[model samples]
Target: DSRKTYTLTDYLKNTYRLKLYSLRWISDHEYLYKQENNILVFNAEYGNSSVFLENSTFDEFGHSINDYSISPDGQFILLEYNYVKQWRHSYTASYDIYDLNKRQLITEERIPNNTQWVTWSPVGHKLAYVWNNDIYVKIEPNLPSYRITWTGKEDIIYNGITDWVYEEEVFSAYSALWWSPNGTFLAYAQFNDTEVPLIEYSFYSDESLQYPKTVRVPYPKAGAVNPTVKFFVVNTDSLSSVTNATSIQITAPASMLIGDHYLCDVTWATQERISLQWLRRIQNYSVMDICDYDESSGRWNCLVARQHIEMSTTGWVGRFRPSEPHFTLDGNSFYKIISNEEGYRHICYFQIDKKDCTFITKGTWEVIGIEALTSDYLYYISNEYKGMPGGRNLYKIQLSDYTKVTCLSCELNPERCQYYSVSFSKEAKYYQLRCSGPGLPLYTLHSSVNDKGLRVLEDNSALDKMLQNVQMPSKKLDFIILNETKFWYQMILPPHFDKSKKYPLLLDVYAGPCSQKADTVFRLNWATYLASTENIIVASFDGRGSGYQGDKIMHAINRRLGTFEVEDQIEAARQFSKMGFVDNKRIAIWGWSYGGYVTSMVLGSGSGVFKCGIAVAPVSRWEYYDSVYTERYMGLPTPEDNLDHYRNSTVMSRAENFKQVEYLLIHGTADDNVHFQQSAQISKALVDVGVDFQAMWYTDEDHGIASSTAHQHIYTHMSHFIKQCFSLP
Candidate 1:
């Protein structure tokens, strides 16, 4: 049925985006929420609230504040100002402490105007931060700051802050500093980018600039000499005001020291002990060592007997590098997710000192994450409900009796909600269930004592009411069995979808390793506009290399990334055509990042399934990508390991094949993640092969093209491309 629907303006302007209720738990029962200019503290039990702090009528510092980091005991709040974002997880800014109790602004020992990073201790008003690449600490809010390290050199040595690669590849966190539970010890990783090569790019400052300046970053690409990292822990209590503080170094295990390795996870098991997980450059083998602090020698030692080694012969470790361990109170036993006998991921209970572990949960599905670990119960988010790989629900398992399992969200509005995110309080008595699927994004409050839901914080009633007048597209989450394995896919069918009618299909592809596109999450974006207004069916498939199902499915790409994933996508398109609902001639594909890589591969396959496609910030060759992530999936691109595979897998190698389809190549000139050179290579390849394709490069934009103006501009232009391709006008 033809009707009024979402327009390109609706997609670009984000007019229908759901308003999510954002709140953070300050204590077990109380949560702090921001409303306009007032900070409200709401009781989690009943959502009752009172203003905790009011906006100043507000600092020379507060006038341009970026964020707030309140203390554990509510003694002071750290003011973050003059922010300049560096990367995905990094932003440098000036920091100042505002004493809540004394009601005064701090001036002495004020964090420098260009502080690199900052954080408060877990249990105290003690503060730690990094500036000019050095680490600093304050035992109390009013005390003088102690210099933790002296050997800080900008862009060369990073003490408490992550370097360019670590921040982008190894960590999604802005800082590398971690405080112990008692706040006496501070752990941090030092990145030495002294030897890594730098990627240089041009940055046009503003509209007034007649010429662009250059920006260089220490970047390590595939098969290159990456940066070295050293881990250290400083005793904040043993700090001397007159003398420099000392930090104890914890070296990697002997097995990993033989070659290049990375410290992936740093977890504080107890005040006296810590856990460090290391991964080799190859990424398949991992080792976890528990370190205990020594009082006699003032040194840190790894317990050799308690060391745990996890190696995967078929693929890389965990989903990324390694799964984190949630330790018990005693720091002896912990629980983690590992692939089971049949390659399915499950929770395994382990003793800190033992090599063998017990599987607490068994399933054909995967445990997405371990939310909160308690003495009596273990709360987790899993996709095991009805064996659907894309649907996630909150679950509880009894520690004493693993057989007594309970499904929390499966029964809560099953028709509307399928995906859930459970954020528990400090004591695990209350939780915030964020449901973002099947229907609108719903936020709710729940109590774990009686396993009862208390109140609805937000249900997106405004968005629901607004969407009622528009012709919204419905989603079809189904699977097509390939070799007796379920390959999931989701199609954004046009409103009043008629199975007998052939519709122009747009396959949105992101077939990277362990990538899941077919999920139960409700996304209102450009695809919704395409399906609603253009009648273009938007579909995404979780092919063989996608995640959550198991290693057998996820590892299907393994060392040969450009093979099985591309085949699976082509086959998925063929199957969609056979269903009679997809118009075979009008089938097209497009993607961003890894999805962009897949889209390029599918279009160049000469399968004739896709008539057009777009690849944004795509990788043309594996050797041009970062070493940490690339080596994990495709191994090194050196002659000794997988060089021929790397040579064979270049999207440029198939440039001759693009002559058959319509292609659009878009990228940001300043994309640090996947450099602009990738798309440059593709553009040159297309020119070499005499293939006519469109290209757009957003000047000075990063990998995300994330600026508000550029984001809207790119989508509006892409909308026209689709409209023309499908003859929508």
Candidate 2:
């Protein structure tokens, strides 16, 4: 045992080395793990482990495998190595194929360099990979790769990978390819970015040369020309015999193509049919279409099954892009989570051919997501506990009549656990319960049928003991009814809080469109340190545009990003000031990304409520952000279409208001998502208006400001800034 006391960073670097990786259950009784660069297969029944692949076998590759995938038949393994990250979720890697049965490498030729993504088919060893913005397929490991698309250019046409907008906003992924369940067909989208504009910036680093290098990205701003996208399906069987494999284009509905639209939520129901969700440019109307593959014409015909039209009486449509439907095992019915009249997201069942849709789970609460589905029960997670928008509990609804709903984890350790996430084993026999807070986090394995904890996986007993001597802050959840609508807010009170004592309040905000900040989950974050040691109260309020309540509140800021959201924060601060313990003169606000954008808006509102604000990677103008996300909320930012909304939403327009507030603006020099120009433009406006403000930039950092050093450095800097703001001469 070590005698020296360790800090959080020390524990993360040293003692945390006991962490495991890639422990996946290949079967009910067998699991796979990569240990010491060798693949190890473990048998639960025998309590024994055997080598699946020896480290000696990988010696010839020169690099260790970073990730791997096994064929369904267990005959082949696809190993990925030499990974070079490209963006948030996209990376390029060299791949090698190995035949498990022969215990030998299958191919001599290495995978192409800059290979964006690769995966094996669900049923077989047939492989697909994206390279040079094009899709390629190999029916067998020994066969030569067949190119599926012919029109792949650098920035003009993208065959398999998503463009900048789609990657950042729509899919949150790099590859736009999906393989059929039977492994017979591959579906991918073609992005034509010819119309999108390019954003040019300079990349400067401390270790770089004298001159900064120019970096250009195809970034389409709001009201700018957007990429035209089309879907196509390729028959994998044709690749072996034909040099030029034909890909059939899946045409969009004629009405949808008339205006700016997005193709989202693509799912494969069968080799011959698929489901796709299409949304109009304004994001007001959404249609889920079932498309059938026509072999005769080599085309796909789509039939609209269900179309959700947003009533002008309310806000925009869906919770956030029509959720991808979960098709039943029989493929006749599908389940989706959509908003009801009460403004809560619930499960709705839809028949494939019938027009009638039935609401499965109905109430004032929201279903977070569909966890798993069995033949008899549809399992999901929800925030159903009254007044606790942050508490998530596991639930299961019977599929037969869809009548009775059972709460699985609601009563477990009631005092210590309010938030729960569960993952089920195959056939729904077992589940892994992750009890995340209102107390120290706990993990346990449980039987789904009996709802009994089988074993304590990680009870955090050590952490619990260590915190016994430490003074921690207490959290309180409450709501404020404004204009008859309930807006929830959570506060982290300083240790030994007294009603008569005045405490500095910090509004931790992320009041973006359809975002939720006030919840019941236990968090030991910067707020904890600030409240416990610095005697500061940290609070977050879920106002209009915050999610989980329903579309009415979530979509309240639609086509008006800086209106209700900013007003709500100012009102929330005023409401907080009314509290006996909160200091009226020492309220501050801060956020990142969209939250940062909202933070800037709140500071520039001239509300006289906030003493200071911090905005990191803030979007200053609607026209400066991405097309899909911006247009979804603010519509087109054109002066001719929505001039007033566009003009009033910008922080630049309210630069003079910042003269009264202590403002700090921070951004990464190389933030690709929100762009550094967003902050730079705001600084220019503030300077032009003679408003004194503090600014900081992290060189060559992205939106997250992520690396270990930068992560710690920025927070430390903000801590000092916040303390100084709260302390007046």
Candidate 3:
């Protein structure tokens, strides 16, 4: 069949995007999804579809809607409008509750025009949200708000939502509030960033502005003063008391109270039991406290006998801070993922008052994640299949016997669906397997008891049909043995690739600590366009600092950030250049953020392997990045600790080496994560050394450079740069 090459326009215009079938299970037999701009519910058992809400249902509301969130019980739908975006994972919107059965908007006790955050309680239709940094509760959609906090200052005090570091690094959400199982009590953390340093940058906006506006954020870099946080729980059922709602404060552990620390995670085992994970600034040590509510004393006490302290003497604990707990139904026991004796992460069962938990699953291979814990079985995803860390498959282990582990996704369509992620129904009776791949993503639903197939929801048949006529790239998911260890590398070769013909190579890297770049997942991205249209071989290698295998390979570059990973990428490029089909003279490397830092480091290494490299919004220095993430890997930038490595692993320090290769440094002035000062210092260093290089700064844009117009413009500019670098017509 005659096929056409996929062009840059195809990528920019969002053409040929995969048709994703995302069905969120609301109940054991039902799921909901947005299709054709309308909310619909599908019966998983009978394969029947019903419209939950029509697209025209909101026409009379008189305003454009951004999204709709339905309540757990399907009694109410929250309509989100006037949606405004914010940094990383934060946003603000105006919300109104709509009665799902009455099909009418609830106009009484209306939410403000600029509500910051909102969420429905797990079991009930009770509304809890943050307005102007304070917490509020709505027992019913029509009820008036009961304010639960008073000390919520704009940037200084955060009542129910996370501040900058906690939002980005710890909770990964703006919500610091936790609702009880039966919606009786509300738990939240208040952050006092009173003395935390602020990073200020000029935000260029609207042509009408006489001067650029200065945006200030209370962000602490490495070795800076971090925010102090306090946890409080309020009884929502007692808020009607004339004496006002009583909120009890829970203090940190004695070990955590002595020095700088952070609230990593908070999970409720039952309505009466709660668990918290606290980590010191060093992050090498963390403690999990399971607190129980004593009804007689009307207080919460951390069980001293049940304290679980996870200390990593060799490297930092777990993957991130520490593993969160997944409790049993009775709340007396829980299962957690912790590194085994050999430094491999696995599931461990912990009794409430036990000091050392029993490791239920153990192996050379690591469990990627714990999916679900049923009464009879605990399902998880792991890379034990073929001993390939680059691939993942779902497996379920019986509670009766840990040895009775069966692979759910491994045997089913082994060739096409080697990598998989699954979502089990509420009752764990049905599951939707998502195979992402060595092939296009395939979504299928199945009955879990026997693992019997029900139906294929979306196999991307339409995408495959469209791709049949397009000369797409072929991926090679293979490995390279270095030091007798299998390090996987993937390559995107041109459609009509030949061993006799040479092609330019582009090494795309993001070798962050405990990060995986080489995976068995299908992606239609810039690499695809480069391979199909530009005939360049796009490659990714999971090197020393990469993850999913174990701590040995992962923590090899732990204290030393840029050394081994940079060497490995350059080495991988050199090895690829030695291949018959690769053109050695045209090899290039590029990455964004951590990837960008690695790209800059590799290009600066003077290895002569990479001809040119591009770094986008990169952290040029460790000291310039945030505290939680930076200190977790690099310890601290202080003189007594990791100052040597911090100073050594810098991109700006190697500015003199850029004279040998073409370099492009792009950063957003408003980048809150890796501040603009990083790239500015890099540019200054290069200029001081009289090295001429390409530099681009985006106005008012963040790390993503993700505005519609800017996203298209940057890719187009990069394409031109790559084409010129390779001397391609």
Clashes of 2: 2
Local distance difference test, per candidate? 0.89, 0.80, 0.89
Give the per-residue lDDT of model 1 (tens digit) for 124-188.
78889888899998887667789888879978899988888888778878699999998989999
Q: What TM value does model 1 have?
A: 0.98
With candidate 3 superimposed using the best TM-score fit, by how many Å does residue 528's alpha carbon deviate from the native? 0.6
The TM-score of candidate 3 is 0.98
Q: Please state the error at residue 394 of candidate 3 in Å.
A: 1.2
lDDT of 2 by residue, 1-729 (tens): 222222333322343222213356565455576777778986534447899878787767777778888876688888888887666787888888888888887666556877888877877688888888889998877677888877888878988888888887788899899998889889999899997899887888667589998878898998888888998888897777676878887777777888888887788876777887777777777667787778888777876554333323365666556687888877677888877767788888888777667889888778999988777889999989754777899887888877688888888788888898876664566667788778877776666666677766567777666665566679998899999989999999877889998899999988888787887777667787788778899999999888888777887887788898889988998888777788888999999998898899999888888999999999998889888888777777666667678878899999999999998999998888888999999999999999999999999888999877888778878888999999868
Number of clashes recorded per candidate: 2, 2, 0
What lDDT does candidate 3 reach at residue 129?
Answer: 92
List the candidate 3 regions with Cα displacement exceeding 4 Å.
none
lDDT of 2: 0.80
Taking every candidate in turn, the Cα RMSD to the unseen true structure, in Å, is: 1.4, 3.3, 1.3
**RMSD in Å for model 1:** 1.4
